[PDB]
Nucleic acid binder design. Sequence first.
RNA 1: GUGAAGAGGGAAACAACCCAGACCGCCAGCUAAGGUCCCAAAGUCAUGGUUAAGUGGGAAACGAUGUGGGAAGGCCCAGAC
RNA 2: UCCUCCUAAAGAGUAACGGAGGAGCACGAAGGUUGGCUAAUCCUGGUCGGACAUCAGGAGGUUAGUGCAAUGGCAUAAGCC
RNA 3: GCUCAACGGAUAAAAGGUACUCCGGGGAUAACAGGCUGAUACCGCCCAAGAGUUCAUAUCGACGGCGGUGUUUGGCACCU
RNA 4: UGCCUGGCGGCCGUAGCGCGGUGGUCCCACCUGACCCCAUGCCGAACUCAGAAGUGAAACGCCGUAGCGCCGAUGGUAGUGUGGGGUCUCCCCAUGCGAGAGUAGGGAACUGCCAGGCAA
Lengths: 116, 56, 75, 92, 136
Amino acid sequence: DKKSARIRRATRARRKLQELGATRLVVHRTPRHIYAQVIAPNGSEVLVAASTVEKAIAEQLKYTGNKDAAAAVGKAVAERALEKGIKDVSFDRSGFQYHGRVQALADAAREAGLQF
Amino acid sequence: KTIKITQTRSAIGRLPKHKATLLGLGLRRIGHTVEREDTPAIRGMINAVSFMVKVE
Amino acid sequence: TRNGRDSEAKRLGVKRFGGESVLAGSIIVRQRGTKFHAGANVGCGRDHTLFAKADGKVKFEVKGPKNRKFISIEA
Amino acid sequence: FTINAEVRKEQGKGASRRLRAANKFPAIIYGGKEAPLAIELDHDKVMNMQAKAEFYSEVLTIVVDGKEIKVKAQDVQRHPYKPKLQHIDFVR
Amino acid sequence: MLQPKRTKFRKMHKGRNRGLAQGTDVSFGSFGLKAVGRGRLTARQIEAARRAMTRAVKRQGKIWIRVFPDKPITEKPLAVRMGKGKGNVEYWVALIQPGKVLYEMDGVPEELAREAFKLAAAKLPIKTTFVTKTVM
RNA sequence: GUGAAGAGGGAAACAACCCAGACCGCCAGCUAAGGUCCCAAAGUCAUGGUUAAGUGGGAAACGAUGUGGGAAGGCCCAGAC
RNA sequence: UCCUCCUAAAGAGUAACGGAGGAGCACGAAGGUUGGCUAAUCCUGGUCGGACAUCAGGAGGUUAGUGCAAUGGCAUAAGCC
RNA sequence: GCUCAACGGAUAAAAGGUACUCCGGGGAUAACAGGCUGAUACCGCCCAAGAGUUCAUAUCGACGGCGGUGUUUGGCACCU
RNA sequence: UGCCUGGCGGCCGUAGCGCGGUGGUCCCACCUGACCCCAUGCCGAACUCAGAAGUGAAACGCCGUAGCGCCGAUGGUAGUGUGGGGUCUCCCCAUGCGAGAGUAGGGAACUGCCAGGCAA
Ligand SMILES: [Mg+2]
Ligand SMILES: [Mg+2]
Ligand SMILES: [Mg+2]
Ligand SMILES: [Mg+2]
Ligand SMILES: [Mg+2]
Ligand SMILES: [Mg+2]
Ligand SMILES: [Mg+2]
Ligand SMILES: [Mg+2]
Ligand SMILES: [Mg+2]
Ligand SMILES: [Mg+2]
Ligand SMILES: [Mg+2]
Ligand SMILES: [Mg+2]
Ligand SMILES: [Mg+2]
Ligand SMILES: [Mg+2]
Ligand SMILES: [Mg+2]
Ligand SMILES: [Mg+2]
Ligand SMILES: [Mg+2]
Ligand SMILES: [Mg+2]
Ligand SMILES: [Mg+2]
Ligand SMILES: [Mg+2]
Ligand SMILES: [Mg+2]
Ligand SMILES: [Mg+2]
Ligand SMILES: [Mg+2]
Ligand SMILES: [Mg+2]
Ligand SMILES: [Mg+2]
Ligand SMILES: [Mg+2]
Ligand SMILES: [Mg+2]
Ligand SMILES: [Mg+2]
Ligand SMILES: [Mg+2]
Ligand SMILES: [Mg+2]
Ligand SMILES: [Mg+2]
Ligand SMILES: [Mg+2]
Ligand SMILES: [Mg+2]
Ligand SMILES: [Mg+2]
Ligand SMILES: [Mg+2]
Ligand SMILES: [Mg+2]
Ligand SMILES: [Mg+2]
Ligand SMILES: [Mg+2]
Ligand SMILES: [Mg+2]
Ligand SMILES: [Mg+2]
Ligand SMILES: [Mg+2]
Ligand SMILES: [Mg+2]
Ligand SMILES: [Mg+2]
Ligand SMILES: [Mg+2]
Ligand SMILES: [Mg+2]
Ligand SMILES: [Mg+2]
Ligand SMILES: [Mg+2]
Ligand SMILES: [Mg+2]
Ligand SMILES: [Mg+2]
Ligand SMILES: [Mg+2]
Ligand SMILES: [Mg+2]
Ligand SMILES: [Mg+2]
Ligand SMILES: [Mg+2]
Ligand SMILES: [Mg+2]
Ligand SMILES: [Mg+2]
Ligand SMILES: [Mg+2]
Ligand SMILES: [Mg+2]
Ligand SMILES: [Mg+2]
Ligand SMILES: [Mg+2]
Ligand SMILES: [Mg+2]
Ligand SMILES: [Mg+2]
Ligand SMILES: [Mg+2]
Ligand SMILES: [Mg+2]
Ligand SMILES: [Mg+2]
Ligand SMILES: [Mg+2]
Ligand SMILES: [Mg+2]
Ligand SMILES: [Mg+2]
Ligand SMILES: [Mg+2]
Ligand SMILES: [Mg+2]
Ligand SMILES: [Mg+2]
Ligand SMILES: [Mg+2]
Ligand SMILES: [Mg+2]
Ligand SMILES: [Mg+2]
Ligand SMILES: [Mg+2]
Ligand SMILES: [Mg+2]
Ligand SMILES: [Mg+2]
Ligand SMILES: [Mg+2]
Ligand SMILES: [Mg+2]
Ligand SMILES: [Mg+2]
Ligand SMILES: [Mg+2]
Ligand SMILES: [Mg+2]
Ligand SMILES: [Mg+2]
Ligand SMILES: [Mg+2]
Ligand SMILES: [Mg+2]
Ligand SMILES: [Mg+2]
Ligand SMILES: [Mg+2]
Ligand SMILES: [Mg+2]
Ligand SMILES: [Mg+2]
Ligand SMILES: [Mg+2]
Ligand SMILES: [Mg+2]
Ligand SMILES: [Mg+2]
Ligand SMILES: [Mg+2]
Ligand SMILES: [Mg+2]
Ligand SMILES: [Mg+2]
Ligand SMILES: [Mg+2]
Ligand SMILES: [Mg+2]
Ligand SMILES: [Mg+2]
Ligand SMILES: [Mg+2]
Ligand SMILES: [Mg+2]
Ligand SMILES: [Mg+2]
Ligand SMILES: [Mg+2]
Ligand SMILES: [Mg+2]
């Protein structure tokens, strides 16, 4: 199984980040689509969420699952997050190597105004 | 409502706890009819040293 | 005899018990390995010594997948 | 295979031993949606009853307060070395 | 003579033989020799009581030994002062509480069983009694 | 816990066991442990049983138609033991 | 002299010429951190090659490992890279 | 810069003999005897594989078991 | 309102295994490919990127099932604090506490925020 190997690969970051009590930006990648959601320091309730599965963002792009789409999500989430009042957050890469789409999402989230 | 407690046995070869309990009830010597307010505590104190006290 | 040796005892155990108000820095448990784990506002030193990181009342919890004992503090 | 039996009122270590030192012993009836029923009964009868192999198989009707309850002997506690019963679990 | 084949520890604390036994029901065989008294059975006593049974019932029948020593008893030599170590392990004993089935027997008559267990009972220090396998 | 560092009453006598903590006096009364036929203060007390061994008033494996209770299990009027 | 376990009577502590074992170091990577990984032992097939070297899959799941005793601990891995 | 490892380290630096002995002490501590104990010793008894031509119990009694004594070897160190 | 997915928790075996199923329009998965980003102590297996032909096989999710695990009374037993007592290596009595194992039975979890698709 792959999933389970990705969960335990993530867990250290998650458990460390819930201990500090920080608002984390979870980013689930998928072969088709990329997701993102800013979750409260308690961990249960979500404040902001956006993805390429949302038609509002899906209708604009060429294909939902690439660096240019991940930037469009990474911008979108950080556009909402500032309207809600969020600014200082952390970035939970969630067992995905900080390299392609997730880096494109992170850089877009930085460029959009979200402080981390 | 009060309860008349009486010490009916010596407190010589006794445990420090039981020696204390009598000091907490206010019993000094054998044949000392001390009356106390009836609460769940005092009944507990009496229950601790029931072997050496008598209730009226 | 063949043996007759022993080590000096280490004074390990729960120092501050559940409910007890502790100060920031106070040691809660000296132990060898993580019998108890660090929860909220509790640290864990090189010696696996759990200590308070904030002024509050010590709380012993039993949570997690493997059913482990955690020590948290709540002000 | 019919035994008269009283309902228990005291129950614990102190009561049970006092009871067993009076030619009786504690048993219990349970089964179905109804509540369990603690049952004091005579020793010398039930000692003679268990010699027969039917006792640990067939249905027994225990008489309690007039009412006859149908049961089977599920489990039983022998006294360690002396030939005598301590306790019987009657399933309904 | 029964003995553990290798152990973790050579010498063991004296302990306190208390409470009631657990091997109380007659499990394997039809008949059994239950220990009424309390005490301890040496390896020698068990073998001596086994030989006395086995010889009484002849080649026929089947016998179990529910007890096993697994407790080493030390003893200090003669003309030796106290201390200067724990003594040396001399014999092996099984602690027997009341209720313990010691021996079990099967494939013989009730008449010839009881007489076989008497001869064993005469070799043992503990007061014993006959017990039959009751169905539940 | 007691003695040590605690006298007094009991356990024959008996630091440590049971009862109980002596400030002094009285030719007063109630009790504790333990006792009540005589030595020696108080029941030859009352009721219902057991014990025949002087058990009580040292001791085991094992031995035995001792002797009391019980709860069962083998036979009768075709009359068993 | 120091460490580990039991004795030690479910906080700590606790003796004996009581019961068992270790230490008088090691390491510029065996530290730091970041990013990864998962073990034993079998089963079946396969050149030399056989019980066992290396490979493949399946079974088991921490019986493994932890620089060295024992203890407590570690998959978020303190394990191996 | 110290196996000051007798590891809170008396000196930088230290082994023996005394039946030729002596002083101060101790029944805080041994040797004799007493005491407590009874593993051992001694003396009984229980079971009875067997021996006794047959036959366990005339006489012996293996394997084991339970006591007594305070006679041995001891243990303890309570008196001196 | 409900039915289906994903994400992130709460709760950690009544929640886990096995077995029997069934699901692809989105969701998820394998699957396609290998200039580019990056990757292999060899290997686009993994990690990674560009895609959307293929299928729900495996995986994953959901429904069914006691195969086991797991939970689990009442009663009794063991143990034990305190005061007594005995035939004192061990017990017993008054009173307080009271298991473990087993037994009847229960049992193929339960939720919260959020996002999408479909019947509305
Ligand atoms: Mg007293
Ligand atoms: Mg006075
Ligand atoms: Mg020291
Ligand atoms: Mg230690
Ligand atoms: Mg110590
Ligand atoms: Mg630290
Ligand atoms: Mg009760
Ligand atoms: Mg209850
Ligand atoms: Mg009791
Ligand atoms: Mg039913
Ligand atoms: Mg013990
Ligand atoms: Mg046991
Ligand atoms: Mg068992
Ligand atoms: Mg000599
Ligand atoms: Mg020596
Ligand atoms: Mg003095
Ligand atoms: Mg006195
Ligand atoms: Mg006196
Ligand atoms: Mg006397
Ligand atoms: Mg007298
Ligand atoms: Mg006198
Ligand atoms: Mg006198
Ligand atoms: Mg004396
Ligand atoms: Mg008295
Ligand atoms: Mg006084
Ligand atoms: Mg005075
Ligand atoms: Mg006065
Ligand atoms: Mg008077
Ligand atoms: Mg009067
Ligand atoms: Mg009297
Ligand atoms: Mg007198
Ligand atoms: Mg008189
Ligand atoms: Mg008279
Ligand atoms: Mg006499
Ligand atoms: Mg007899
Ligand atoms: Mg009759
Ligand atoms: Mg030192
Ligand atoms: Mg301990
Ligand atoms: Mg302790
Ligand atoms: Mg303790
Ligand atoms: Mg020591
Ligand atoms: Mg050494
Ligand atoms: Mg390294
Ligand atoms: Mg290296
Ligand atoms: Mg290391
Ligand atoms: Mg890491
Ligand atoms: Mg990097
Ligand atoms: Mg290991
Ligand atoms: Mg270890
Ligand atoms: Mg453990
Ligand atoms: Mg490391
Ligand atoms: Mg020194
Ligand atoms: Mg030296
Ligand atoms: Mg020192
Ligand atoms: Mg020193
Ligand atoms: Mg020198
Ligand atoms: Mg000389
Ligand atoms: Mg001279
Ligand atoms: Mg002199
Ligand atoms: Mg002198
Ligand atoms: Mg001395
Ligand atoms: Mg001599
Ligand atoms: Mg002399
Ligand atoms: Mg002498
Ligand atoms: Mg004597
Ligand atoms: Mg003797
Ligand atoms: Mg004689
Ligand atoms: Mg004889
Ligand atoms: Mg004889
Ligand atoms: Mg012959
Ligand atoms: Mg003597
Ligand atoms: Mg003599
Ligand atoms: Mg004697
Ligand atoms: Mg002597
Ligand atoms: Mg002396
Ligand atoms: Mg002494
Ligand atoms: Mg003199
Ligand atoms: Mg559970
Ligand atoms: Mg299937
Ligand atoms: Mg399918
Ligand atoms: Mg498709
Ligand atoms: Mg591929
Ligand atoms: Mg691929
Ligand atoms: Mg298709
Ligand atoms: Mg379901
Ligand atoms: Mg069903
Ligand atoms: Mg089950
Ligand atoms: Mg539970
Ligand atoms: Mg259970
Ligand atoms: Mg429970
Ligand atoms: Mg209960
Ligand atoms: Mg008591
Ligand atoms: Mg008395
Ligand atoms: Mg008597
Ligand atoms: Mg309870
Ligand atoms: Mg239970
Ligand atoms: Mg059991
Ligand atoms: Mg259970
Ligand atoms: Mg059921
Ligand atoms: Mg059901
Ligand atoms: Mg289930
Ligand atoms: Mg069902």
